[PDB]
Amino acid sequence: GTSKLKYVLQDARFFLIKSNNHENVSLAKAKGVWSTLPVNEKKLNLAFRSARSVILIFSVRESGKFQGFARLSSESHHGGSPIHWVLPAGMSAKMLGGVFKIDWICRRELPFTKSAHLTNPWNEHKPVKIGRDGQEIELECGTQLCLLFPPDESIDLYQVIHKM
Ligand SMILES: Cc1[nH]c(=O)nc(-c2ccccc2)c1[N+](=O)[O-]
Numbered sequence: 001g002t003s004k005l006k007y008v009l010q011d012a013r014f015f016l017i018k019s020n021n022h023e024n025v026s027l028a029k030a031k032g033v034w035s036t037l038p039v040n041e042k043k044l045n046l047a048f049r050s051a052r053s054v055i056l057i058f059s060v061r062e063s064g065k066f067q068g069f070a071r072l073s074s075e076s077h078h079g080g081s082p083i084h085w086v087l088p089a090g091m092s093a094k095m096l097g098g099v100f101k102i103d104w105i106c107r108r109e110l111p112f113t114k115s116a117h118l119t120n121p122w123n124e125h126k127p128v129k130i131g132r133d134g135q136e137i138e139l140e141c142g143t144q145l146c147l148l149f150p151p152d153e154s155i156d157l158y159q160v161i162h163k164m
Contacts, residue, residue, distance in 0.1 A: 002147065004157035008071065008105065008164070012053035014142025015044065018133040022060050023086040025067045029107050033083060034070070034100050040134035041097030045075045047136075052164055055142065056102060059129065066110045066129075069146055070102040073163055103160050106152040110145075118145055 017034065019025050028034050034056060036044065047054045054072040059065065076098030085093065112129040119125040121138045128137060128145050137145065 002151070004161065005105070005147070005151075006143075008053055008157055008160055009055065009143050009146055010053075011051065012055050012071075012139070012142070013047045013051045014055045014057060014137040014139070014146070015040075015047070016128075016131040016133070016135045016137055017056045017058045018131070019058065019060050020088055021086050022063070022067075025058050025060055027083060027085065028058070028070070028102065029068065029104060031083065032070075032102055032104065033080075034102050035076075035083065035085065035096045035098065036100075036134065037095065038097040041076050043134060043136075044072065044100065048072050048075050055105070055146065057137070057142070057145065064112050066112075066115075066145075066149070068104060068107045068109070068152075069149065070104045071160060072100055073103050074101040076100050103163070104152075105155060105157070105160060106146070106149045107154070108150045108152050110149045114148055115145055118148075 057069040058067045078098045118128040120128045120141050122136050123131050
C-alpha cells in the first residue's frame with residue numbers, strides 16, 4: 001500500500017531535478033548519490049536542515065517522463081569516491097558542488113501525461129513537469145505527484161523511516 005509513503009512525505013519539501021541524460025540518473029540510482037551545481041547545493045543544504053524530508057524528483061530531458069524520486073539522507077560533502085557524471089558540452093566536473101547521499105523511494109518512471117492535472121504554485125502554476133533544474137515544488141503538488149508514481153515494491157520504506 002501507500003501508507004508508509006504518505007508518512008515519509010508528511011511535511012516534506014520537494015525539488016525537481018532535471019538531467020540532460022539517462023546515464024546520470026542511472027548512476028544516482030546505483031550509487032545512492034546526487035551532485036548539483038552550487039546554486040542548488042546551497043538551497044538543498046538549507047532545505048535539508050529545514051524539514052523532516054527533502055525529496056528530489058528526477059526527470060531526464062526529452063524523455064517525457066520522471067524517472068523516480070529519492071530522499072536526501074545527508075547534506076552535501078566533498079572528497080568522496082569520484083563519480084563519472086556525463087556532463088554537458090563545455091562543462092567540467094569541478095563546476096559541481098559536493099555530493100548528497102540519497103535513499104531512493106521509487107525507481108519507477110511516470111509519464112508527464114499522468115501529471116497534467118498538477119501545477120506548481122511556486123512556478124507560476126505551470127504544469128509540474130515544467131521547471132529548471134532545482135525548482136522547488138510546493139508541498140501539496142509535490143505530494144500528489146509522488147503518489148502518482150507506480151509503487152516500487154523493491155523498496156522497503158521501513159529503512160527510510162528509520163532515518164527520520
Ligand atoms: C549530474 C549533474 N547535476 C547538476 O545539477 N548539474 C550538472 C551539470 C551541468 C553543467 C555543468 C556541470 C554539471 C550535472 N552533470 O553531471 O551534467
